[PDB]
Design a binder for this molecule. Structure first.
Ligand SMILES: *[C@@H]1O[C@H](CO[C@@H]2O[C@@H](C)[C@@H](O)[C@@H](O)[C@@H]2O)[C@@H](O[C@@H]2O[C@H](CO)[C@@H](O)[C@H](O)[C@H]2NC(C)=O)[C@H](O)[C@H]1NC(C)=O
Ligand SMILES: *[C@@H]1O[C@H](CO[C@@H]2O[C@@H](C)[C@@H](O)[C@@H](O)[C@@H]2O)[C@@H](O[C@@H]2O[C@H](CO)[C@@H](O)[C@H](O)[C@H]2NC(C)=O)[C@H](O)[C@H]1NC(C)=O
Lengths: 103, 103
């Protein structure tokens, strides 16, 4: 499987994913219509992509960033992870709802 | 003064500005509430910043990009240009409404 978890900060949250076997990870943000948006560095939307010292991918998003929605007094962002082979095919896809503050 | 003009393309438009005396140019996109957003490379919003061969700054924006509004069957994007000194102070500010297709 794919190792992932998310942390809640003061001004935003970050999602850390660890792919195996040389695979890569693509993050896609979802809106209320189910449309999928590729995640890239975006200062206007408060989206950022970085690699950790352990070799993991880190997607950090501000609470007031693009497509982060407010429901029941909590920040919620629906992100789908696509774990892919170097050929460009998707090996596995996971969907996670980042809800801050937890639970 | 500051030299600028915009061109209408098929899928988007680009704004070209030419600052003098070593000044720099900052592009800010405006929404309907008057809030000012700094323009940077943003694949999700279809905003891009590049420098031309003549040394000018080029801001290209897709017609379906962020804050591009539809009024009277035309794409309209309100952009404010800040011409600044290397000290960080604003020397001059111009506001332009990019309307495509012209007029
Ligand atoms: C995407 O952008 C990051 C920089 O984003 C920053 O960090 C966020 C938390 C945000 O709040 C701002 O502080 C910053 O804009 C790039 O990251 C750095 O990566 C370069 C390249 O390896 C490295 O030289 C820098 O030292 C890094 N910065 C820090 C503070 O360690 C990142 O490279 C960009 N990614 C792509 C693909 O363009
Ligand atoms: C910001 O991004 C551009 C690349 O954006 C591209 O062009 C747009 C029209 C878009 O539709 C896509 O095709 C692309 O993502 C960067 O530009 C290039 O700049 C580098 C650096 O000088 C150069 O090596 C490349 O050859 C350029 N690409 C081309 C096609 O000429 C630009 O550098 C980025 N700016 C910043 C500040 O990060």
């Amino acid at each position: 499987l794919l190792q992932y978890h998310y942390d809640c900060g003061d001004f935003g949250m970050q999602l850390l994913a660890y792919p195996t076997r040389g695979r890569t990870v693509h993050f896609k943000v979802l809106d209320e219509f189910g449309t999928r948006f590729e995640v890239a560095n975006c200062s206007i939307c408060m989206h950022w992509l970085n690699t950790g010292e352990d070799g993991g991918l880190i997607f950090s998003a501000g609470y007031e960033g693009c497509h982060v929605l407010v429901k029941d007094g909590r920040y919620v962002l629906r992100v789908q992870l696509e774990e892919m082979l170097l050929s460009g095919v998707v090996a596995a896809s996971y969907e996670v709802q980042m809800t801050c503050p937890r639970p």
